[PDB]
Amino acid sequence: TRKSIHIGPGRAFYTTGEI
């Protein structure tokens, strides 16, 4: 229960709750 960030080139800012 922390987070799920999948950023690469620096444009894809995927911030999903780790619930």
SS (H, E, C) the chain: CCCEECCCCCCCCCEECCC
- Name the nearest CA neighbour of 14 among 3, 6, 2, 1: 6
Q: Which technique? A: NMR
What is the C-alpha separation between 12 and 8, in angstroms, rounded? 7
Tokens standing for residue 5: 């960030």
What is the C-alpha separation between 19 and 10, in angstroms, rounded? 24
Q: Taking CA 9 as the corner, what is the angle to CA 18 and CA 19, rounded to the nearest 5 degrees?
A: 5
> Distances from the Cα of 17 to the Cαs of 8, 12, in angstroms?
19, 16
Quote the distance between the C-alpha of residue 2 and its chain's center.
10
What is the C-alpha separation between 6 and 9, in angstroms, rounded? 10
Tokens standing for residue 3: 């987070």
